[PDB]
Design a protein around this ligand. Structure first.
Ligand code: IHP
Ligand code: ZN
Length: 417
């Protein structure tokens, strides 16, 4: 039930977000085999919910009355996200008690494998008594059936806004994806080495070859959006951070890593693998449902921000000295902001697609599979949504400032024709 210090050596680094560090199990305890632990970080940037947050998530009491942030995250996924996405592809993760010594031991144990800039920003919140055990989807099913290749995509937002509330100078937000605009700021802030080739509009397009174009793009410039695992081990993409362009060195390493799984002449494993991922993505149409959650951002931050200030009962700084939104009932305003924060979740979650050579000996042969015509292989696949985090209400402020920043910088750069 409780993870003590000694257990620390059994977990190895897997990756990290901005708010969570993730370790994969390595020991042999039946409880944790094929599981990962998601540990919340203590940001120096920043009870379980603010006074305003209880007001918003009011319709969902199991949420507002949570003991810790771990159960809060659990109940959010379970009570808000599942009903929207389906329980087939989402698991909320079992909670577990952890000791302060365990956490402190883990933090120091992994410090060396972490990106420096990540360490600068946060460590594990050693005040928490809890943590989350999820399944290790770099392993196919629970408990085996031969090697497993899995891909983790962070697709980000795949639609263009359409809001009335987009200002006059900012109307370029209508044409260009937020992702592409944001790339110019990251590159400006020395957050990435070169602009990524990826355009989420291709991935979400519902078009077969635009999906392939996206997967190819992802492979070329993975940054923080593309990872590939072999039996849990990272074989492509950055570890808890963005990575540089796929060089011929990296490309080759990955090309080697795929031996046997994709059954093709040496050198052609990579392009066939990409085809496979593209086919599963498109076939499953699992993106369509996600994009729907995303499109719950009906009004865009420039619209929704006005509602936020009505929620937190403060004079809206964004209107100086719109009738439309500020005349809405409190009820309607809460809906808008809630759904914005849900969309937010959806825009930052990641997909895991686990592959495995079709096992003819299954008790119930899977519904979902991809036939690889050229290599004569059939692969079974599963899709799962991960990193489904509740976004904190106060963030509404920083969302607006950030967006304003992106769109001004993009306009600024364009004005140099
Ligand atoms: O720290 P990074 O890996 O560069 O990614 C951050 C981070 O996403 P993670 O959840 O993956 O860390 C932010 O979330 P927090 O961890 O700070 O909660 C998220 O912001 P929101 O999820 O609040 O939108 C932001 O995404 P965005 O840039 O869309 O705000 C995103 O940055 P990138 O995904 O652009 O790298
Ligand atoms: Zn306003």
């Amino acid at each position: 039930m409780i993870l003590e210090e000694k257990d620390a050596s059994d977990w190895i680094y897997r990756g990290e977000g901005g708010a969570n560090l993730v370790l994969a199990y390595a020991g042999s305890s039946p409880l944790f085999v094929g599981k990962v632990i998601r540990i919340q970080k203590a940001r120096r940037n920043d009870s379980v919910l603010t006074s305003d947050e209880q007001h918003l998530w009011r319709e969902n009491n199991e949420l507002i009355s949570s003991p810790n942030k771990e159960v809060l995250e659990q109940r959010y996924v379970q009570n808000v996200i599942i009903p929207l996405l389906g329980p087939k592809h989402v698991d909320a993760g079992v909670r577990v008690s952890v000791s302060k010594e365990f956490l402190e031991c883990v933090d120091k144990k992994v410090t060396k494998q972490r990106p420096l800039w990540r360490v600068n920003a946060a460590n594990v919140d050693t005040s928490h008594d809890s943590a989350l055990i999820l399944n290790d989807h770099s392993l196919f099913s629970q408990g085996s059936g031969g090697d497993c290749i899995s891909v983790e995509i962070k697709p980000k937002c795949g639609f263009l806004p359409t809001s009335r509330f987009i200002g006059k100078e900012n109307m370029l937000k209508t044409s260009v994806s937020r992702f592409k605009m944001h790339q110019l700021l990251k590159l400006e802030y020395i957050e990435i080495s070169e602009e990524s080739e990826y355009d989420p509009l291709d991935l979400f397009s519902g078009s077969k070859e635009r999906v392939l174009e996206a997967i190819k793009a992802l492979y070329s410039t993975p940054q923080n959006n593309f990872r590939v695992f072999l039996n849990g081990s990272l074989i492509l993409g950055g570890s808890g951070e963005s990575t540089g362009r796929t060089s011929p060195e990296i490309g080759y390493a990955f090309e080697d890593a795929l031996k046997g799984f994709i059954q093709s002449e040496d050198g052609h494993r990579t392009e066939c693998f990409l085809q496979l991922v593209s086919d599963a993505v498109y076939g499953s149409g699992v993106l369509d449902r996600l994009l729907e959650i995303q499109k719950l951002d009906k009004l865009d931050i420039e619209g929704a921000i006005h509602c936020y200030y009505d929620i937190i009962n403060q004079p809206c700084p964004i209107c100086k000295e719109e009738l439309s939104l500020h005349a809405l009932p409190l009820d309607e305003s809460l809906k808008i902001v809630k759904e914005y924060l849900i969309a937010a979740t959806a825009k930052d979650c990641s997909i895991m697609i686990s592959f495995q050579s079709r096992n003819a000996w299954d008790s119930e042969p899977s519904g979902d599979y991809v036939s690889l015509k050229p290599t004569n292989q059939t692969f079974d696949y599963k899709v799962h949504f991960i990193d489904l985090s509740l976004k904190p209400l106060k963030r509404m402020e920083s969302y607006y400032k950030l967006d304003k920043k992106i769109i001004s910088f993009y306009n600024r750069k364009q004005k140099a024709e």
